[PDB]
Write an enzyme that holds these catalytic residues in place. Structure first.
Site, PDB file in Angstrom:
ATOM      1  CE  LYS A   1       0.382   8.397  -1.735  1.00 49.92           C
ATOM      2  NZ  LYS A   1      -0.920   8.103  -2.418  1.00 49.92           N
TER       3      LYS A   1
ATOM      4  N   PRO B   1      -0.269   3.732   0.373  1.00 49.85           N
ATOM      5  CG  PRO B   1       1.734   4.835   0.700  1.00 49.85           C
ATOM      6  CD  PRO B   1       0.336   4.813   1.170  1.00 49.85           C
TER       7      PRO B   1
ATOM      8  CB  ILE C   1      -2.758   6.483  -5.377  1.00 46.72           C
ATOM      9  CG1 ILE C   1      -3.693   5.272  -5.285  1.00 46.72           C
ATOM     10  CG2 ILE C   1      -3.378   7.539  -6.308  1.00 46.72           C
ATOM     11  CD1 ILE C   1      -4.982   5.556  -4.519  1.00 46.72           C
TER      12      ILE C   1
END
Lengths: 114, 114, 114
Positions: free
Chosen positions: B32, B1, B64
């Site tokens: 993440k 991120p 993503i």
């Protein structure tokens, strides 16, 4: 094309040369006339990556097309390599955000490319 | 991120701490590894919001994936809250632009995530 | 709406006035309440365009809709004209990246517009 670099390292005396070299390399790789390449370098920005303040870099790259197949990999290799060499930022601390921009969403000279 | 903050308020001495705290919080919320979180804070930028120069902030957030369902609301709550607390910018003067970026459009370490 | 300007020319004393004027003009053109318009101006950024360091400018414009048909052309005319007049940057050295952002990808006030 457009390449905007935002880096944590201090400003460099050779920013102009660095950007000019990046500009010609990017034109050739993307198959675009260098006339249309825009670049920037903003250093001294407080940044973290992986939770720490070691040298790090965010790049945005935009183009009207020319980012098909292996192109985003090839651009990343070029850009990370250029930044590693010239700013001393390790490639594993560089992120690049890519966008293939429709021509009608790209303004220039009081109009758009669409 | 990725989270890039552009704020109108003056630079703060605790930018590093502020970003590190934001970094860990964002990793946890997005699910993440913090290894992959990149952050920045650019203060002192001339800005207006609602026609005036009161404290204001633009944030860009990219990931993503991980921005499904209620996630963009939850990230906004986190980010606006963190910025309110640490920069004294009211949440109603904060904008966040989100992008769910395809992995092949995200460069890192001389290649892409795709 | 959001308009972020990144320019190569030195900082200007009338940045606030310049942005306020841009803010009202953009609200009217997009048919948005000016309450919701956010602007910024970052000058003194090392940039090249067409391989040289002459005055140049990158602008990002975002909106939740309101960028249909001729709108991106009309916004470019407004923005390039305003920047030409106020910063002395020729319109043929100005790029604008546009994005029509879904409301759920636009954070504000601890939530999103979606």
């Amino acid at each position: 094309p457009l390449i905007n670099i935002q880096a944590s390292v201090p400003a460099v005396a050779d920013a102009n040369s660095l950007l000019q070299e990046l500009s010609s390399k990017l034109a050739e790789l993307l198959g675009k006339p260098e006339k249309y390449v825009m670049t920037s370098l903003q250093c001294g920005v407080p940044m973290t990556f992986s939770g720490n303040t070691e040298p790090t870099c965010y790049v945005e790259v935009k183009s009207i097309g020319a980012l098909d197949g292996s192109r985003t990999q090839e651009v990343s290799e070029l850009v990370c390599g250029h930044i590693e060499q010239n700013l001393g930022i390790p490639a594993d601390r560089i992120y690049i955000g890519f966008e293939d921009v429709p021509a009608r969403l790209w303004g220039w000279n009081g109009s758009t490319f669409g």
